[PDB]
Design a protein around this ligand. Structure first.
Ligand code: LDA
Ligand code: LDA
Ligand code: LDA
Ligand code: LDA
Ligand code: MET
Ligand code: MET
Lengths: 600, 598
C-alpha cells in the first residue's frame, strides 16, 4: 500500500504516476511511449552531432587518409548543421506529443479532487471569497503545471544526458575528466540549491511588500470621494510613496541575489571548462588526442550545462509544485463523514411520512443540541416547527437531507431509516426553500432549470408561473437569458425567494421544507410570498420552520421544540388554549409588533 | 513634443527622462556604469572566440608538438576566463541598473497616482478590488518585463549584431555578411508573424481556463445548493467539459510554439550549414585557417542565443508599450475642475451658503438643476427635501466643487467658490455621506483622517462628541483596533459615528448631512439623529433627507421641485400652505401606517 510510506516528494510523484500511465486509455499510453522515444532520439542526436564537428576538424588537420579533405570536412559540417536542426525537431515533437498527456493527466487529477470535495461533509464551510480562492487555485494550477513540465522536460533529459556524457567521457578520455565533470556538476547543484533557498526567502518578502503597496494605492483610489472630502491627497500620495520605496528596496535585494547565483554558477562551469580544455590540448601534445577532440569536449560541456542554467528557478518551482500536489492528495485522502452503506437500496416514497425517532445530535461532540427529539409528520399534512433560542430547530433541515447523522436515534421516511438508503434518492424526495437563497453565475432561466437535470422550457415556464415570477422575467430585456447573481443583475429578496420556489417546483418533490424561508424579507414582501408558498404546498408533505409564529398560524398542526425536545404539539388554537410555551411566545411577539408600530 | 506619431517610440522617448532624471546625479552615475558594463560585456564576449580560434590555429600551425602547447594552453585559458568575465559583466550591469529601473517605474507610478487624484470624480472610480488589483498587477508586471527585455536583451543584441556585421565584413565574406543579415531578417519576420498568431491562441486559452475555473469555484461556494438538488454529477460533468475545452486550447497553443521553434531552428541552422561549409571551402584554398571554422560557428551561436526568446520578448515588449502608453494617457487627460490663476483662499468669517441661479447636470443632454437659488443664513439648521426630480442629490457634490455649474454660481460667505483655491474651500466643509467608508486601518487612523496632524487628544474629543467613545473603550485594542476588511466589522450606526467623528476632528464651519441616515434601521436613525443635532451646534448645517420626519425640527426647510426652489419655510408653515411639502408629508405618513397595519 503506497499510502503506508514517508510523506515526501517521492510519494506524491508515485501517486501521480498512474495518471500518466492510465491503462484505461491506451491512446495516451501510446503518446507516452512516443514521447519517450522522441526524448531518446533527441539525446541521440545532440550527443551524435558533436562527433560530426570533431570529425570535420580532424579531416582538416590530419588530411593523411581523410581525402579529399575538402569533401570529408564539408560532409561532416553539413552533418552537424542537420544534426542541430534535428535535435530541435525531436524536442518540439516530444513537447507537442506529451502536452496532451500532461493536460489529460492533470485534468483527471482535478476531476477526482472536485468529485471528492463534493463528497466531503458540509462542516468544512466552503463558502468564502471567490477572488481569494480563485487566486489560490490559479496559483496552484500554474504551480503543479510548471513542476510537471520542468520534471518531464528538463530534469529527466538532463539526467539522461548526464549519464550518457559520463559513459562517453569514461570510454574515450580521463577518467580524470569524468571525476572532474562529476565534481563540477555536484558543486553546481549544491551551490544552486543552497543559494536558491535564500533567494526564495527574499522573493517572498518582495512579494509581500508589493502586495502592501498595491493595496495602499487601490484602497486610496476606490475612495476618491473620501480622499477629496478631507483634502488628504498629499497624505495618500506620501502614504503610497513610502510603501512603494519599501518594495523597491526589496526588489533591488532580490534581483541582486539573482546576480550572485549567476556568478557562482558561471564560476564553477568555467573552471571546469578551463581545466578540461587544458587537459585535452595537453593530451593532444602527447599525440594521444586529436585537435577535433578539443571541439568535441568543449561542445559536450556547454551542451551539458545549458539546461542547468535554469536550475535555480526549476528547483524553486518543482519543490513548490510538489508541495501543492501533496495538498491535493491530502484532500482526496480525507475521509467521508456521511457515506451510503454498502449495497444501499433506494428510498421508496409510496406514502411520504416523516419520523424522528429519538434523535440525539450536535455539530460538535462537546455541545449537544437535540436531546432525544421525537415526532411524526403525517403524509400530505402541513406542519410547522417552532421553538425559542435553544430549541434546536435549525438542525432539522440539515438532518433531513442527511448533511449529518444523529449521534443516537434515527430519521425515517415512509418507514425507511434514511441512514441506510442511497443519499441521492433520499435527497430526490426533498425540496427546500432556504432563508439565504443563492444564485449561480448564469441566467435566471438556468437557475430555475437547476431543480431537475433535464428540465424543459415548459417546466421552467410552469414553475416560474407557480411562483409568480414569470411576469417579472417577461419585463426583462433579455428575459430568461438575463444574467443574474454577482457580475450580473441584482435581484430583490422576494425575487430570489421566488426563483427558489420555482426551482423546488421544477424538482417537484413529495416532501417540501421551508427553512426560515421568509425571515430574510421585509413585512410586505413576506406577506406577499406567503400566499405563493401556501399555494405550492398543496398536495405534498410540507415542513415549515419559522421564527415568526404568525406566518405559520394556519398549520394543520404545530410542533413546539424546547431545549432540543418536543415540548408542545397541536393546532394554533389548542396551543393558545394550553397557555403554555407556544402561547407565551405568541404573546411576546405580538407585543413587539405593537411597540414597533407606535414609533411613527 | 506630444505632437508625434504616438507609437512605441513616443512612449519610450517620454519614459527616457525617468531613466536620466537630471534631478538625481546618483542614478545618472548608475546609468553610465550600466552602459559601461554593457560595453565591457560585449567587448569580452566578442573577444573570447578569438581566443578559441588562436588555440585551434596554434595546434595546426603546427609542424609537431613544439611551443604550440604553451600557446594553446594560454589561449584556451583566456577563453574560459573570457566566458566567465562576460557573465560577470552582464550580472554587474543588471545589479547596477536595477536601482535605476525601480526608481524610474516608481516615479512614473507616483505621477500617475498624483494626477489620478487631480482628475475628475466622473471617472466612475467604483469597481471591484480584485479586478483593479489584478489589472494593476498585470500592467506593472508588464512594464517591468518590457523594460528589462528592452534594455538588457534587445539593446545588447543590436550592439552585438552590428559588431558581427563589422567583423564578418573585415575578415570574411562579404557573402558571409549578407548571409547572416538575410538570416537575422528572416528570423525576425518569421518570429514576429508566428508570435501574432500565438498571442491570439494564448488569449483564447486564458479565456477558456478562466471559464473552467469559474465553473468549479461557483460550484464549490454553492455546495449547499448542489447538495439540495443532488446535482453533483451534473456539476462535475459541467466542469469536465469546460476543462476539456481548456486542454484542447492549451495543446493547440503549445503546438504553435513547436512550429515557431522548428522554423527558428530551420533558419539558424541553414545559416550554420552554409556559413560553416563556405568557411571550410575557404580553408581548402589556404585563405582561411582551421581556427576560422570554430570562430564563425561560435560567433553565430552567440549571436542567435539571445534571439532564442525573441517570440516571448516581442509579445511582451509589445504589451508593455501598450500599457505604458495607457499610463501617459491618464497623465495627459485634462483636469475638469481647476483653481483659477492666482486663486486666493476662501475666508470663512460669516458661514453663509448661497446658490445663485445654478444650472447643472452631470451630462449636457440631461439637465438636473434648472436655475436653483437659495440662501442658507450663517449658523442655521436647514434641510433640503424634494421628490424624485428635484435634483437635491447634486447639492453636496456642487458645494465641494466636484463639478462647476453650467450656469450660475455658488458662494460661501460672500465669495464665489469657483474663484478660490479648492483646498481652502473644502477645509470649510464637513460632510457625513450616506455610505460612510472605512479605510483598511485602525479606528484611530479613520477618525484622525479628518485633519492632517490630528492628535490622539483630538481623536478622543471628537469620538466623544459623536458618542462612539464608549464603544471604542470596550474594544481590547481600543483606538488601535483594525477595521475595514480584514478587520472588525462595524455596524451602520458605528460607521456613521466614526464618520461624524472624522468631520468633528476637522471642525468645519459648515456641515452637510447628505442622506446621512438613509442606510440605517429606524432605532439606529433615531439614536444617531440626536448626536447629529448636538454636533450641529455652532455650525451652518445642511441636511439632505429623503424621510421628511427626520428633518421636521429644522429652522427652515428648502423644498425643491424639477431642479428649482418651489417652497421654503418652517415645518408648520409648510404644512399650513397645503402645498408640495404637505403632500409629501401626508404620503410618507400614510406609508408608515400601511407597514404597521401588516
Ligand atoms: C490538479 C491540477 C490543478 C490543481 C490546482 C492546484 C491547487 C492549489 C493548491 C492547493 C493548496 C496550496 N497550499 C499548499 C498553498 O495550500
Ligand atoms: C485604471 C488603471 C489605473 C492604474 C494607475 C495606478 C498606479 C498606482 C501604483 C501601483 C503599483 C504597485 N507596484 C508598483 C508596487 O507594484
Ligand atoms: C513599478 C511599476 C509601476 C507602473 C504602473 C503601471 C500600471 C499599468 C496598468 C495598465 C492597464 C491598461 N489596460 C487598460 C490596457 O489594461
Ligand atoms: C482549496 C483547494 C481546492 C482545489 C480543488 C479544485 C479542483 C478543480 C479546479 C482545477 C482548475 C483547473 N484549471 C484552472 C486549469 O482550469
Ligand atoms: C533562464 S532563468 C536562469 C537563472 C539562474 N541561472 C538559475 O539557475 O536559477
Ligand atoms: C522558454 S523561452 C522560448 C523562446 C521562443 N523561441 C520564442 O522566441 O518565443
Amino acid at each position: 500500500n503506497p499510502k503506508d510510506a514517508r510523506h515526501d516528494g517521492w510519494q506524491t510523484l508515485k501517486r501521480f504516476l498512474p495518471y500518466l500511465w492510465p491503462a484505461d486509455n491506451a491512446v495516451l499510453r501510446r503518446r507516452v511511449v512516443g514521447a519517450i522515444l522522441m526524448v531518446l532520439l533527441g539525446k541521440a542526436t545532440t550527443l551524435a552531432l558533436p562527433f560530426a564537428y570533431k570529425k570535420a576538424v580532424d579531416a582538416m588537420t590530419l588530411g593523411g587518409g581523410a581525402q579529399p579533405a575538402l569533401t570529408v570536412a564539408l560532409a561532416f559540417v553539413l552533418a552537424y548543421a542537420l544534426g542541430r536542426f534535428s535535435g530541435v525537431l525531436f524536442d518540439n515533437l516530444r513537447n507537442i506529443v506529451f502536452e496532451r498527456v500532461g493536460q489529460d493527466a492533470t485534468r483527471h487529477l482535478a476531476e477526482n479532487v472536485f468529485a471528492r470535495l463534493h463528497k466531503l461533509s458540509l462542516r468544512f464551510h466552503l463558502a468564502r471569497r471567490t477572488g481569494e480562492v480563485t487566486k489560490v487555485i490559479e496559483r496552484g494550477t500554474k504551480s503543479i503545471d510548471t513542476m510537471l513540465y520542468f520534471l518531464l522536460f528538463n530534469i529527466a533529459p538532463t539526467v539522461i544526458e548526464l549519464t550518457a556524457v559520463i559513459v562517453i567521457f569514461w570510454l574515450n578520455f580521463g577518467l580524470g575528466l569524468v571525476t572532474a565533470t562529476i565534481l563540477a556538476v555536484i558543486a553546481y547543484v549544491w551551490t544552486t540549491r543552497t543559494i536558491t533557498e535564500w533567494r526564495t526567502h527574499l522573493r517572498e518578502k518582495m512579494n509581500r511588500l508589493d502586495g502592501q503597496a498595491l493595496a495602499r494605492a487601490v484602497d486610496s483610489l476606490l475612495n476618491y470621494e473620501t480622499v477629496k472630502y478631507f483634502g488628504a491627497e498629499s497624505r495618500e500620495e506620501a502614504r503610497y510613496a513610502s510603501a512603494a520605496r519599501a518594495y523597491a528596496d526589496a526588489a533591488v535585494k532580490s534581483e541582486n541575489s539573482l546576480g550572485l547565483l549567476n556568478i557562482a554558477q558561471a564560476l564553477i562551469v568555467n573552471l571546469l571548462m578551463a581545466g578540461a580544455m587544458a587537459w585535452t590540448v595537453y593530451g593532444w601534445s602527447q599525440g594521444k588526442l586529436t585537435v577535433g577532440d578539443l571541439v568535441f569536449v568543449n561542445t559536450y560541456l556547454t551542451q551539458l550545462f545549458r539546461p542547468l542554467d535554469m536550475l535555480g528557478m526549476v528547483y524553486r518551482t518543482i519543490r513548490q509544485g510538489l508541495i501543492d500536489m501533496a495538498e491535493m492528495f491530502r484532500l482526496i485522502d480525507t475521509h467521508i463523514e456521511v457515506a451510503d452503506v454498502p449495497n444501499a437500496p433506494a428510498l421508496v416514497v409510496n406514502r411520504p411520512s416523516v419520523t424522528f425517532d429519538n434523535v440525539v445530535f450536535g455539530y460538535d461532540r462537546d455541545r449537544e443540541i437535540l436531546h432525544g427529539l421525537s415526532f411524526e409528520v403525517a403524509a400530505g399534512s402541513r406542519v410547522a416547527i417552532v421553538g425559542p433560542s435553544g430549541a434546536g430547530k435549525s438542525t432539522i433541515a440539515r438532518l433531513l437531507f442527511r448533511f449529518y447523522d444523529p449521534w443516537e436515534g434515527r430519521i425515517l421516511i415512509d418507514g425507511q431509516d434514511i441512514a441506510h438508503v442511497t443519499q441521492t434518492s433520499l435527497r430526490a424526495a426533498l425540496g427546500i426553500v432556504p432563508q439565504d437563497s443563492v444564485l449561480f453565475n448564469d441566467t435566471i432561466g438556468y437557475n430555475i432549470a437547476y431543480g431537475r437535470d433535464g428540465a424543459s422550457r415548459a417546466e421552467v415556464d410552469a414553475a416560474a408561473k407557480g411562483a409568480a415570477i414569470a411576469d417579472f422575467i417577461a419585463r426583462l430585456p433579455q428575459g430568461y437569458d438575463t444574467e443574474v447573481g454577482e457580475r450580473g443583475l441584482k435581484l430583490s429578496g422576494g425575487e430570489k425567494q421566488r426563483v427558489a420556489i420555482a426551482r423546488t417546483l421544477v424538482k417537484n418533490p413529495p416532501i417540501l421544507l421551508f427553512d426560515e424561508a421568509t425571515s430574510a424579507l421585509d413585512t410586505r414582501t413576506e406577506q406577499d410570498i406567503l400566499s405563493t408558498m401556501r399555494a405550492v404546498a398543496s398536495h405534498r408533505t410540507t415542513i415549515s420552520i419559522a421564527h415568526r409564529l404568525s406566518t405559520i398560524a394556519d398549520s394543520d398542526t404545530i410542533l413546539v421544540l424546547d431545549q432540543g425536545r418536543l415540548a408542545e404539539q397541536g393546532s394554533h388554537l389548542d396551543l393558545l388554549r394550553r397557555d403554555g410555551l407556544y402561547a407565551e411566545m405568541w404573546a411576546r411577539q405580538a407585543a413587539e409588533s405593537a411597540e414597533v408600530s407606535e414609533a411613527a
